């Protein structure tokens, strides 16, 4: 698709068999989702946002579908104001910025 | 142009007579820049992102140039860790996400 930016670029994602809404954020290096259960072991990561730093749980090699496009990558879980899809998965689905 | 998302999508902006580097952020509601002087009236604002909120000054009807494309809009100025161009100016230069 081509998505304009007059409204928030909110899309539907599917992870762990569940649908969620998430924001396509090209200012984000990483993908961060609100609290949820995922399989496997996790590693610690401290990430910084506009308000400061948070601790999150890092899960690697997680399947996730974004607007129907299949990706498999790193997902961070923790106290975020909204689910954000960052460049690590934007690049997997072939996203670019055009103007 | 077409901008790849393998790296952070940084561009040069011209604003208030100054040249600055800033991140094109499709998930950002607002444009927020590190401390700098701008002309005219302002009002304070709290803005939230990962890690919580910071207090900024809001200046409206500010001219800006982004990769050679002129626009005008609201610019927020405060202790942001990094300069972000949000959707309020990205729309004006005809920036879309495509995949
Ligand atoms: C390299 O570090 C990062 O990539 N950090 C990201 C990040 O915060 N990116 N920022 C870009 C903006 C992300 C976001 O768009 C996510 C984000 C999108 C949308 C919401 C909240 C957060 C929804 C709620 C309110 C609206 N708030 C926003 O739009 C705010 C605002 C424009 C006001 C700063 N937007 C954002 O906070 C830039 C940045 C880079 C380095 C550091 Br240290 C700190 C910040 C993530 C924490 C999301 C992974
Ligand atoms: Cl990844
Ligand atoms: Cl505006
Ligand atoms: Cl348009």
Report what the structure shows:
It is classed as hydrolase. Keywords: hydrolase, protease inhibitor, rational drug design. The assembly is dimeric. The structure is a homodimer of 99-residue chains. Chain A has a single domain (1-99), classed as Cathepsin D, subunit A, domain 1, CATH 2.40.70. The first copy, chain A, is globular. Helix content of chain A is 4%, strand content 54%. The first copy, chain A, is mainly beta. Chain A has one helix and nine strands. In chain A, strands 2, 3, 4, 5, 6, 7 and 8 form a seven-stranded mixed β-sheet that branches. Chain A has one helix at residues 87-90; strands at 2-3, 10-15, 18-24, 32-33, 43-49, 52-66, 69-77, 84-85, 96-98. The A-B interface holds A 1-6, 8-9, 23-29, 32, 47-54, 67, 69, 80-81, 84, 87, 90-91, 93-99 and B 1-6, 8-9, 23-29, 32, 47-54, 67, 69, 80-81, 84, 87, 90-91, 93-99. The site of one chloride ion (CL) has 3 residues of chain B, from strand 7.
Q: Strand pairing plus helix content of chain A: what structural class?
A: mainly beta
| Rg of chain A, nearest Å | 13 Å
Oligomer: homodimer
* Ligands present: the ligand COC(=O)N[C@H](C(=O)NN(CCC[C@@]1(O)Cc2ccc(cc2)C/C=C\CNC(=O)[C@H](C(C)(C)C)NC1=O)Cc1ccc(Br)cc1)C(C)(C)C, chloride ion
What is the name of the CATH superfamily of chain A?
Acid Proteases
End-to-end Cα distance of chain A:
15 Å
Secondary-structure element string of chain A: EEEEEEEEHE
| Helix share bin of chain A | under 10%
Percent of residues in β-strands of chain A = over 45%
Protein name (chains A, B): Protease
Subunit structure (chains A, B): Homodimer, whose active site consists of two apposed aspartic acid residues.
PDB class: hydrolase
Keywords: hydrolase, protease inhibitor, rational drug design
